[PDB]
Amino acid sequence: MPMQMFMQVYDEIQMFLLEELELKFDMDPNRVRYLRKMMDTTCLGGKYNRGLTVIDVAESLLSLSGARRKRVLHDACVCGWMIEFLQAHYLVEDDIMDNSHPDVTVQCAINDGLLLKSWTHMMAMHFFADRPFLQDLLCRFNRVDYTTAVGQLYDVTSMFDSNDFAEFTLSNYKRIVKYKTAYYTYLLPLVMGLIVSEALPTVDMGVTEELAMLMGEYFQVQDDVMDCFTPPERLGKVGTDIQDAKCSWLAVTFLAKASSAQVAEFKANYGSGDSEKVATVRRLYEEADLQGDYVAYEAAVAEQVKELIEKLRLCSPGFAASVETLWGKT
Amino acid sequence: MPMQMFMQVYDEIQMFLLEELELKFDMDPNRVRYLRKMMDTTCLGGKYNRGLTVIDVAESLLSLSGARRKRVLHDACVCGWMIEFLQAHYLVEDDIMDNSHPDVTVQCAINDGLLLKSWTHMMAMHFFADRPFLQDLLCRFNRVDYTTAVGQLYDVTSMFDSNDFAEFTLSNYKRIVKYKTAYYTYLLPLVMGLIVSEALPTVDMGVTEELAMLMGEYFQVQDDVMDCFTPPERLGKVGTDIQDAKCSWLAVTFLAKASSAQVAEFKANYGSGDSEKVATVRRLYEEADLQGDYVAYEAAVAEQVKELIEKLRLCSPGFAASVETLWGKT
Ligand SMILES: CCN(CC)S(=O)(=O)c1ccc(C)cc1
Ligand SMILES: CCN(CC)S(=O)(=O)c1ccc(C)cc1
């Protein structure tokens, strides 16, 4: 029922967007079918955890505050696809960075990125045209999107000086995770579920923001370790954080407990594509027992999460049930 | 006074955006100064015709409907910078297409494009937080931005089949100009001036949209001819429409009046970087007396413009004065 309803609304949203182009933007069928394929390629095939989270928050709040149910659930599905389209937009933008007479494939990739973002506005302005929260929804959505772009800047420049391992600290690592990932992956689905359920001013936002940041941190630390030690055919991709000189949890944790000569060896081998230098970094990580510290770090974070949901439950019990399910996914 | 007030509000807007990053997004001074420089580089130095148009529409409506004057004029200046920032965003996106181990300059260019667009939302949500039109403003702004991205798609793919001179027609040329340029360069400043002046539902939008499309068409046809025949040091850039196989006014007009063998020669030489083939295309344009048809075409368009402003003047006299000044700039 959850996934089945999410996919039906996708068909409804897609048909509105494509018919709107046909009927109001003078688009020819060849381009409509081209955009239908591009939308399917970029928005479908993931796990939809951000979008389904909106629905779960919505159903948990109509059980503890007929016609309002069906409407709130449909609005939750449209909000779920807003985030999924936003995620598709970020992935297209991220491919343009590493993918490389006018090059029409790069022109169309840039265009795809612009269309996917604009589609989030177009579907909200249509399906929520008569909702009292449309203005608040757009503002909280645009602010989270801005937050993510700022987080991207923090991440991309963490090894230089914007016109260098000084910013390789744990507090800066958390700032990157917070802005680049946590706000739109964990906080935004929860907020949108509260908005369509009319129960936004009934929750402790501070505890909610604190939980979203902590859950993103838990997820990103595990992602950083898997990027380094999980082999490609099991991870799903080729891990590249060492070659890309990423400010990863492994890198900042190693620098805190390495000897002066190891730091020299780390700094000499980090951020290179050579197989031996990458392997030297993995050797340094192993010999520093980082995968031992990884277990303890996540355990402590999980304790802060498992104990922060209860504060939220004292005044928002239905909210905390969905936050627990979202945490269980992490 | 007009330009002097527009630049003061720029300083106010910039200081809010940068302080917001410092105070609410945890941004370090090195990055704040980096973004201040990027903002100055991308948003300043143009002619500001889109942004000043908002102010001119605003002042023409407070003269024919003290505290309301100063507020509406400040709101007009913020709306003017929204469009200017949006223009800066499109130019950054356009540079990524032709500008080309992670390449941090391309990463920062993509990031710049995202920040410039998000800044349009952030400045509107702040300076219009207590305005009744904030929601309508955001929706009309997002729809025009969407319109421009659709126009980009029409332009970039006018020579292929989205997975070829069939789309080299005058009606398709107008569709490209309408969506890619006219809506955000001519219609959007007028609309925003009406929104902040509270006089939006007091004008004939059909005549207004018709004028915006016609003015963009007039401007783009002149731009197409200058791109081909005005030498680079006088045009300000190297004209590249022939090499890029653009659907220009010259190309669609030539195909309507060329002989079968000339079309073969045109099709054989169009869309190539070779100096002789580009010169052959210029030779074909000259021998077809296109710069003679150019004068007549603009004259006829100017007549439709000079006569459409009067319809708008019968019910919106103050509006038509600013539209005349905007047309005079064209
Ligand atoms: C603004 C997003 N950024 C790219 C412009 S990003 O932070 O690198 C990013 C890339 C991909 C994903 C799924 C999320 C974020
Ligand atoms: C969405 C805009 N497009 C780029 C993504 S564009 O139509 O090519 C364009 C480029 C530059 C300018 C100033 C205007 C439009």
Ligand code: NA
């Ligand atoms: Na998701």
Ligand code: NA
């Ligand atoms: Na301008």
